[PDB]
Scaffold this active site. Sequence first.
Site, PDB file in Angstrom:
ATOM      1  N   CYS A   1      74.877  71.370  52.294  1.00 55.92           N
ATOM      2  CA  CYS A   1      76.047  71.056  51.553  1.00 55.92           C
ATOM      3  C   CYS A   1      75.573  70.643  49.904  1.00 55.92           C
ATOM      4  O   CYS A   1      76.134  70.157  49.451  1.00 55.92           O
ATOM      5  CB  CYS A   1      77.244  70.115  51.918  1.00 55.92           C
ATOM      6  SG  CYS A   1      77.961  70.600  53.558  1.00 55.92           S
TER       7      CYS A   1
ATOM      8  N   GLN B   1      76.948  58.253  51.207  1.00 57.50           N
ATOM      9  CA  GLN B   1      75.609  57.894  52.102  1.00 57.50           C
ATOM     10  C   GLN B   1      75.021  56.493  51.826  1.00 57.50           C
ATOM     11  O   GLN B   1      73.945  55.920  52.228  1.00 57.50           O
ATOM     12  CB  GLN B   1      74.395  58.681  51.741  1.00 57.50           C
ATOM     13  CG  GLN B   1      74.997  60.434  52.198  1.00 57.50           C
ATOM     14  CD  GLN B   1      74.686  60.412  53.818  1.00 57.50           C
ATOM     15  OE1 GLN B   1      74.173  59.522  54.460  1.00 57.50           O
ATOM     16  NE2 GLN B   1      75.312  61.543  54.141  1.00 57.50           N
TER      17      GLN B   1
ATOM     18  N   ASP C   1      79.698  58.720  44.256  1.00 59.85           N
ATOM     19  CA  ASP C   1      80.003  59.367  45.517  1.00 59.85           C
ATOM     20  C   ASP C   1      79.129  58.208  46.368  1.00 59.85           C
ATOM     21  O   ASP C   1      78.208  58.333  46.341  1.00 59.85           O
ATOM     22  CB  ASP C   1      79.234  60.583  45.625  1.00 59.85           C
ATOM     23  CG  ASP C   1      79.576  61.350  46.925  1.00 59.85           C
ATOM     24  OD1 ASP C   1      79.802  60.663  48.014  1.00 59.85           O
ATOM     25  OD2 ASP C   1      78.977  62.404  47.305  1.00 59.85           O
TER      26      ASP C   1
ATOM     27  N   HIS D   1      76.088  66.504  46.419  1.00 56.41           N
ATOM     28  CA  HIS D   1      76.976  67.326  47.696  1.00 56.41           C
ATOM     29  C   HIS D   1      78.016  68.122  47.134  1.00 56.41           C
ATOM     30  O   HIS D   1      78.586  67.821  45.841  1.00 56.41           O
ATOM     31  CB  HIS D   1      77.268  66.102  48.399  1.00 56.41           C
ATOM     32  CG  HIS D   1      77.854  66.550  49.807  1.00 56.41           C
ATOM     33  ND1 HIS D   1      79.284  67.487  49.762  1.00 56.41           N
ATOM     34  CD2 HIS D   1      77.426  66.484  51.188  1.00 56.41           C
ATOM     35  CE1 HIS D   1      79.542  67.529  51.234  1.00 56.41           C
ATOM     36  NE2 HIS D   1      78.519  66.970  51.858  1.00 56.41           N
TER      37      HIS D   1
ATOM     38  N   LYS E   1      80.860  58.502  58.885  1.00 51.39           N
ATOM     39  CA  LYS E   1      79.436  58.046  58.424  1.00 51.39           C
ATOM     40  C   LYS E   1      79.100  56.756  58.610  1.00 51.39           C
ATOM     41  O   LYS E   1      77.921  56.145  58.579  1.00 51.39           O
ATOM     42  CB  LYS E   1      78.907  58.890  56.913  1.00 51.39           C
ATOM     43  CG  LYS E   1      78.953  60.317  57.089  1.00 51.39           C
ATOM     44  CD  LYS E   1      79.064  60.897  55.647  1.00 51.39           C
ATOM     45  CE  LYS E   1      78.767  62.577  55.881  1.00 51.39           C
ATOM     46  NZ  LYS E   1      78.253  62.968  54.680  1.00 51.39           N
TER      47      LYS E   1
HETATM   48  C1  LIG Z   1      79.353  63.295  53.814  1.00 50.08           C
HETATM   49  C2  LIG Z   1      79.156  63.622  52.362  1.00 50.08           C
HETATM   50  C3  LIG Z   1      79.953  63.788  51.580  1.00 50.08           C
HETATM   51  C4  LIG Z   1      81.388  64.662  52.444  1.00 50.08           C
HETATM   52  O1  LIG Z   1      82.079  63.488  53.198  1.00 50.08           O
HETATM   53  P1  LIG Z   1      83.259  64.028  54.070  1.00 50.08           P
HETATM   54  O2  LIG Z   1      83.583  63.003  55.272  1.00 50.08           O
HETATM   55  O3  LIG Z   1      82.880  65.269  54.953  1.00 50.08           O
HETATM   56  O4  LIG Z   1      84.448  64.508  53.037  1.00 50.08           O
HETATM   57  C5  LIG Z   1      80.233  63.842  50.196  1.00 50.08           C
HETATM   58  N1  LIG Z   1      78.789  63.271  49.677  1.00 50.08           N
HETATM   59  C6  LIG Z   1      78.092  62.969  50.330  1.00 50.08           C
HETATM   60  C7  LIG Z   1      76.814  62.527  49.667  1.00 50.08           C
HETATM   61  C8  LIG Z   1      78.083  62.995  51.675  1.00 50.08           C
HETATM   62  O5  LIG Z   1      76.910  62.900  52.279  1.00 50.08           O
END
Ligand SMILES: *Cc1c(COP(=O)(O)O)cnc(C)c1O
EC number: 2.8.1.7
Lengths: 405, 405
Positions: B363, B202, B199, B122, B225
Site C-alpha cells: 500500500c 505503525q 499517521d 501509506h 495492529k
Molecule cells: C495499517 C496502515 C494504515 C491503514 O490502517 P487500516 O487499519 O487498514 O485502516 C495506514 N497507515 C499506516 C502507516 C499503516 O501501517
Amino acid sequence: IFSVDKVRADFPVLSREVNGLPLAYLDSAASAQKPSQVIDAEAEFYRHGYAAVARGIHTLSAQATEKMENVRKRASLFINARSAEELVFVRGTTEGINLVANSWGNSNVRAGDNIIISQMEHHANIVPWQMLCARVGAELRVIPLNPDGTLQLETLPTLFDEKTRLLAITHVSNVLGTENPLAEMITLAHQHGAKVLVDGAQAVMHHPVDVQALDCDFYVFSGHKLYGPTGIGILYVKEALLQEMPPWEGGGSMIATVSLSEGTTWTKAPWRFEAGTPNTGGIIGLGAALEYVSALGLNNIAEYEQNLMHYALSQLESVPDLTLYGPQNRLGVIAFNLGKHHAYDVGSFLDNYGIAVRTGHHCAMPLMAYYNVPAMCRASLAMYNTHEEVDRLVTGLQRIHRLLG
Amino acid sequence: IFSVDKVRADFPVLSREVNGLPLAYLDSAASAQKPSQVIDAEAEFYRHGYAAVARGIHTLSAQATEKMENVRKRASLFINARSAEELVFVRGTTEGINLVANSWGNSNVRAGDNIIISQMEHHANIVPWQMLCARVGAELRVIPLNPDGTLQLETLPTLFDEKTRLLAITHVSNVLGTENPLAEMITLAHQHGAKVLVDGAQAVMHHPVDVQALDCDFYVFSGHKLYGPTGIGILYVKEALLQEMPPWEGGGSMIATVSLSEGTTWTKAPWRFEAGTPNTGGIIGLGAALEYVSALGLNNIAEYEQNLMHYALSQLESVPDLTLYGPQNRLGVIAFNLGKHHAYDVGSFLDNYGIAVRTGHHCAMPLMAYYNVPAMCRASLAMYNTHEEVDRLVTGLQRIHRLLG
Ligand SMILES: *Cc1c(COP(=O)(O)O)cnc(C)c1O
Ligand SMILES: *Cc1c(COP(=O)(O)O)cnc(C)c1O
C-alpha cells in the site's frame, strides 16, 4: 417446527440476572443477543486463523481472504441478490445509507430535484438525505402517516414528479412494526425513473427477504440486529448502478494504481467501496449469524414470532390505560405508553423488575412528533422470547399502573 | 524485564502449523495476532453483558455505555491526550483520515491552497488528500525521500508557504521502519499556521506516544495492529479544532434534534462524529488490548524489539545478494529483496517453509516507484517473535538463493 427452549439454550446472556432478578430481554430491536455459535466463530478465527486479508501470499492471509469472500457470497444468497459482487461490507445500516447518499447522491441529485422519505423513518434514513439536500440544493419530501401507523399512500401523486430522483423508505418500522408495501411503491418509483433505497434493518431477522423480487436499487441492514456482532453490515446495490458509482472513502485496497504525479485509479466494485483493513472478525461473525438463522429457518422464526406477538397483544388488553401505537399486524415490536406516566419512568420500573425495554424517541423524533408525545416505550418480541416473558411484562405494567395511578 | 516465552503463551495462533510446519508469523505490521486476554474480553462481553449502548435506561444498556466511555478514557490516557472527549472511535486509521479530510478539509482547504504529504506515505494517507485536492482545487505537495529511506528535509522551505493548510505525515513508515522527526516538523508547520495530521498506525505498538508533547493537531491509529480486534481505531483531535468541525456521517446518536420542517441540529464532539450503533464489541476488545500492552510496558516492549531487530540485521548480513531498504535504525519492519528474484516468489518459498512475510507494494506504490522496484518483501519483528524465528528467516533466504541462483 420451532423449539424456543432449544434456541434459548444457545444464548448465554439469557441466563443473566439483572438487579437480583432473571433478565427478560425485550430490546432486540435496538440490538440482538448473539448465540454462542456466533460468538465462538469469531473467537475461534482470532485464536487459530487470524491474518490480514489483502490476498496476501502467505497461507493464513490467503485463507482469511477466502473466508471473507465466502461470507459475501453467503450474504448475497441470504437476500437473493443475483451476484455476490452486488454486496458491500459496511459498519451497519447507517454507514451504508451515508455511502449511497454521498457516492450515488452527489452525482445523481441536482439543484431543484427532490427526494422522498417517510415520516416513520429512523434518523439513519433521514439525516444523510437532509445533508445531501443541503449540499446540492434539492428538496426532501415526506410521505405522512395515518393514525394507525401506516403510510398515507394517497399522498404519493403529489410527491412523485419528473424531478423525483430517489425514494428512501423503511421496510419495517423500528417503532411501530409496520411493514410497508415495498414492491408496489418501487413499481411506482421506477415508473418515474426514481431509484429506491430500502432500510431493511428491522426486516431481515423476521422473514425471508428477496431483493430481486422487490426490485429495490439499494438495500441495507445491520449484523448486530441479526444475532450477529457489532461493527458490520451489508449494503446491496444493483450491479449496473454500483459499477457506475464513484468511491467514497479513499485508501488502500480500493485503488488500482496510486501515483503522486499521474493521479490514482480505482479498482472494481464492490472492493472500490471498502477502504482499509476490513472488519474481518465482524465478517466471520456475521457469516456465522446467517448460518444460524438459516438453520433455524426464517419461516419457522416468523411463525413463532407471530404467535408470540398475537399472544402479547391479547394479554396487553388487560392493562388499564395502555396506549398502543401502530397497526394490529405489527412485526417485531410493540410501542406503547402507560396512562399519563412518562415512558422513562415506566421503563425504569420495568428495568427494576429485570425487564429490559427501550424508552425515549427511538431515533424517530418525527414519528414521536406525529403522535404528539415526547417518548414511547417499546418491547421487542424476538425468536428467543417466551410467553412467560410476556406475562412478566403485562404484570409489571399492571403493578406500575396500580402504584403510580 | 521482558520474557518473550511468557508473552507467546498468551497468543493461541502462535502454536498453529502452516503447510505441516510450525508458523513463524512475521507479518504483524499488516495485522497483529491477539492475546487470549483480548479475544476473551470481547467474547465475555457478548456472553454476559451485551446490549445496545444508547445510554439506554435498562441496566445492561447503561452498563455497556459506561464500558464504552471507559475505553475512550483509557485510550486517551494511553496517548496522553488532555481529554477523553478529544478521541473519536473510527473503523481504523483509514476511516479516521477520511473523516478529517472531509469534515476538516472541506471547510478549511480552498482553491489555490496546498497540502503537504511525504513520498513514503501509506495509501491511507495519500488517497483522501488526492480526493480533497480534487474537490476544492488545491495542490498536493510531496516531501521526497533520501536513498537511505529518510525524508529529504532540506526541501521543506520550497514546500511550506502561506497557503499551506495541512501537513499529513507518517510517524513510522510501514515499509521502511523509518521514524520521522515529528516534533520538529510540527513546530515548522505551526509557524505557518498549518495543521498537522500524524499517521501513527505503525508507532503506537512500539513505544510510548504522547500527543501533547508532539503537539500534533490530529493523530490516528488502528486497533488490529495494536494486538486488538479488527473494525476499530482511534482518531485524536485537539479539542479546539474538534469542537468547530462539522459532522461527516449523519444518523442516530450524532443529532440533538431531528425535524422534517425545521431541520436537524448536532450534538457535541466527540459524539457528533459517531453515527449509528458503535462497534461495541471492537471497543471492548480494544480496551483489553490497551490494558495488555500497558501491563507489559511499552519501554519493555521497545527494548526487546530493538534487541531483536539488531540481531536480525546482524544475521541477515550472511544472506548473499540481499538488498535492504531503509535506515539502519528502523523500527518494526525489514523491507528487502533477494537478488533479482521477484518478491512474490521469495515470499512463496518462505510461506512454503511456514514463514509468513508480506510481499508486494505494501500500500505504498509511490515508495516502490522511488526505489524503482515493483515490489518488496517485508518481515515484521514484533514483541512475540524470537531469535529462532529470525534464524529460520535467514536460513530460508539462504536456501532460496542457493536453489534459484
Ligand atoms: C495499517 C496502515 C494504515 C491503514 O490502517 P487500516 O487499519 O487498514 O485502516 C495506514 N497507515 C499506516 C502507516 C499503516 O501501517
Ligand atoms: C437499527 C436501525 C437503523 C440503524 O442501524 P445501525 O446498526 O445503528 O447503523 C436504521 N434503520 C432502522 C429501521 C433501524 O432499526
